[PDB]
Enzyme design. Sequence first.
Site, PDB file in Angstrom:
ATOM      1  N   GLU A 258      23.528 -21.149  -2.538  1.00 55.83           N
ATOM      2  CA  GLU A 258      23.682 -20.771  -3.938  1.00 55.83           C
ATOM      3  C   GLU A 258      23.003 -21.840  -4.765  1.00 55.83           C
ATOM      4  O   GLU A 258      23.109 -23.021  -4.444  1.00 55.83           O
ATOM      5  CB  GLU A 258      25.156 -20.671  -4.388  1.00 55.83           C
ATOM      6  N   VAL A 259      22.338 -21.440  -5.839  1.00 54.58           N
ATOM      7  CA  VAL A 259      21.514 -22.346  -6.631  1.00 54.58           C
ATOM      8  C   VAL A 259      22.074 -22.403  -8.043  1.00 54.58           C
ATOM      9  O   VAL A 259      22.333 -21.357  -8.651  1.00 54.58           O
ATOM     10  CB  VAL A 259      20.050 -21.884  -6.640  1.00 54.58           C
TER      11      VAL A 259
ATOM     12  N   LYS B  21      21.252 -26.927  -5.011  1.00 52.35           N
ATOM     13  CA  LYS B  21      21.342 -25.860  -4.016  1.00 52.35           C
ATOM     14  C   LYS B  21      22.482 -26.195  -3.067  1.00 52.35           C
ATOM     15  O   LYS B  21      22.356 -27.086  -2.223  1.00 52.35           O
ATOM     16  CB  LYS B  21      20.022 -25.722  -3.268  1.00 52.35           C
TER      17      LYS B  21
ATOM     18  N   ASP C 236       8.777 -18.010   5.075  1.00 54.64           N
ATOM     19  CA  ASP C 236       9.558 -17.211   4.142  1.00 54.64           C
ATOM     20  C   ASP C 236       8.788 -16.993   2.845  1.00 54.64           C
ATOM     21  O   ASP C 236       9.381 -16.947   1.764  1.00 54.64           O
ATOM     22  CB  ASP C 236      10.917 -17.862   3.880  1.00 54.64           C
TER      23      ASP C 236
HETATM   24  O1  LIG Z   1      12.846 -16.754 -10.113  1.00 54.04           O
HETATM   25  C1  LIG Z   1      12.693 -16.561  -8.882  1.00 54.04           C
HETATM   26  C2  LIG Z   1      11.683 -15.518  -8.509  1.00 54.04           C
HETATM   27  C3  LIG Z   1      10.452 -15.690  -9.353  1.00 54.04           C
HETATM   28  C4  LIG Z   1       9.318 -14.722  -9.263  1.00 54.04           C
HETATM   29  O2  LIG Z   1       9.568 -13.498  -9.268  1.00 54.04           O
HETATM   30  N1  LIG Z   1       7.966 -15.062  -9.164  1.00 54.04           N
HETATM   31  C5  LIG Z   1       6.990 -14.050  -9.092  1.00 54.04           C
HETATM   32  C6  LIG Z   1       6.094 -14.090  -7.848  1.00 54.04           C
HETATM   33  C7  LIG Z   1       4.666 -13.988  -8.255  1.00 54.04           C
HETATM   34  C8  LIG Z   1       4.358 -13.473  -9.542  1.00 54.04           C
HETATM   35  C9  LIG Z   1       3.031 -13.375  -9.995  1.00 54.04           C
HETATM   36  C10 LIG Z   1       2.000 -13.800  -9.156  1.00 54.04           C
HETATM   37 CL1  LIG Z   1       0.332 -13.670  -9.732  1.00 54.04          CL
HETATM   38  C11 LIG Z   1       2.304 -14.319  -7.867  1.00 54.04           C
HETATM   39 CL2  LIG Z   1       1.023 -14.840  -6.800  1.00 54.04          CL
HETATM   40  C12 LIG Z   1       3.625 -14.415  -7.423  1.00 54.04           C
HETATM   41  N2  LIG Z   1      13.452 -17.362  -7.956  1.00 54.04           N
HETATM   42  C13 LIG Z   1      14.382 -18.394  -8.367  1.00 54.04           C
HETATM   43  C14 LIG Z   1      15.859 -18.137  -8.129  1.00 54.04           C
HETATM   44  C15 LIG Z   1      16.726 -19.335  -8.603  1.00 54.04           C
HETATM   45  N3  LIG Z   1      15.950 -20.296  -9.378  1.00 54.04           N
HETATM   46  C16 LIG Z   1      15.526 -21.541  -8.832  1.00 54.04           C
HETATM   47  N4  LIG Z   1      15.591 -21.658  -7.471  1.00 54.04           N
HETATM   48  C17 LIG Z   1      15.209 -22.826  -6.823  1.00 54.04           C
HETATM   49  C18 LIG Z   1      15.315 -22.871  -5.386  1.00 54.04           C
HETATM   50  C19 LIG Z   1      14.942 -24.042  -4.707  1.00 54.04           C
HETATM   51  C20 LIG Z   1      15.000 -24.105  -3.158  1.00 54.04           C
HETATM   52  O3  LIG Z   1      15.790 -23.351  -2.470  1.00 54.04           O
HETATM   53  O4  LIG Z   1      14.162 -24.885  -2.564  1.00 54.04           O
HETATM   54  C21 LIG Z   1      14.455 -25.171  -5.410  1.00 54.04           C
HETATM   55  C22 LIG Z   1      14.348 -25.142  -6.816  1.00 54.04           C
HETATM   56  C23 LIG Z   1      14.735 -23.935  -7.538  1.00 54.04           C
HETATM   57  C24 LIG Z   1      14.649 -23.832  -9.002  1.00 54.04           C
HETATM   58  C25 LIG Z   1      14.170 -24.934  -9.781  1.00 54.04           C
HETATM   59  N5  LIG Z   1      14.096 -24.853 -11.137  1.00 54.04           N
HETATM   60  C26 LIG Z   1      14.477 -23.700 -11.798  1.00 54.04           C
HETATM   61  C27 LIG Z   1      14.969 -22.568 -11.096  1.00 54.04           C
HETATM   62  C28 LIG Z   1      15.048 -22.651  -9.657  1.00 54.04           C
END
Ligand SMILES: O=C(CCC(=O)NCCc1ccc(Cl)c(Cl)c1)/N=C/CCNc1nc2cc(C(=O)O)ccc2c2cnccc12
Length: 330
Positions: A50-51, A66, A154
């Site tokens: 969980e984040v 995390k 992944d």
């Molecule tokens: O939002 C998302 C999905 C985003 C998304 O749909 N992209 C689009 C893909 C895409 C689009 C256009 C193009 Cl053109 C291309 Cl090519 C690709 N996923 C986040 C969930 C929680 N958010 C965070 N999760 C983390 C986890 C870890 C770990 O587990 O290492 C470390 C750090 C973080 C983190 C750090 N700062 C802020 C938030 C988070």
Amino acid sequence: GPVPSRARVYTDVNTHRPREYWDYESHVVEWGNQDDYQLVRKLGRGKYSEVFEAINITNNEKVVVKILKPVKKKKIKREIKILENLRGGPNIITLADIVKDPVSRTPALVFEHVNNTDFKQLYQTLTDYDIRFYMYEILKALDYCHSMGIMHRDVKPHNVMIDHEHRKLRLIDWGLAEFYHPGQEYNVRVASRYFKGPELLVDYQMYDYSLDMWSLGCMLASMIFRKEPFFHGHDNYDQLVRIAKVLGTEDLYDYIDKYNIELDPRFNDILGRHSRKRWERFVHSENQHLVSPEALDFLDKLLRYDHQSRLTAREAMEHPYFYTVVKDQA
Ligand SMILES: O=C(CCC(=O)NCCc1ccc(Cl)c(Cl)c1)/N=C/CCNc1nc2cc(C(=O)O)ccc2c2cnccc12
């Protein structure tokens, strides 16, 4: 028995390092104290974690925490060591701290915060240039971690953070990442169904970095064609069927024969016979603006059954699809 396989790039990088680089089981962890981090809000629940957005109270820096769900202490030391080894690499998320909640003694990882963006309106105002720029950024991360002897295993859109305001990308969630060792047989129950390479689907265990390149092509197909996910499998067996109906079956049974892969008896009577489709049959009026000859040629050279003939990350980054993106960076 299956025919052995070697990664055709970065094959031996880990044999050449000190053993402490990849022997993560003997890695000693210096477990910090939480409480240096107050949880602000929950940002997501995964299968293994969980984040939370959190604040470091000592300096007020925004941060992400995390909290790892119970797994073998092995899997945690793996993720930590890989994170530690990749720290500072291009577009690799930064591991900031390693902590343990003082009462629950549950392990947690503290990452840099990224100001990721509303992917809803991001997917609508997506330009052909946008997709090329960020695909290139992912490849930078992929080529670097492969060069460090590490498969991500992944790659998928949820694991790509984009701060579109600042044109910044971070590849995240390294909890399934593994060290590549030539001749090692890996678990195939990794990654998410829609992005699994055929090697995973047919149970071929001697795979390598080229697995990430398949997933990347799935992300590419899904975006330029405006079809998410591109291979929409009912389950892991119907996933290979969905791939077969696009890539054709002739290459499939050649891949099977080439590696003497024994196929599941479920498979005989569900794959059937299918022709390799031309990509033009997935173009239509609402996605032409993202499809080009270069896009299709690049995509074709990622989505191959044989993992050996998929482009390497470095090869990919030289493909004509990225010529303009490469210019602007100079
Ligand atoms: O939002 C998302 C999905 C985003 C998304 O749909 N992209 C689009 C893909 C895409 C689009 C256009 C193009 Cl053109 C291309 Cl090519 C690709 N996923 C986040 C969930 C929680 N958010 C965070 N999760 C983390 C986890 C870890 C770990 O587990 O290492 C470390 C750090 C973080 C983190 C750090 N700062 C802020 C938030 C988070």
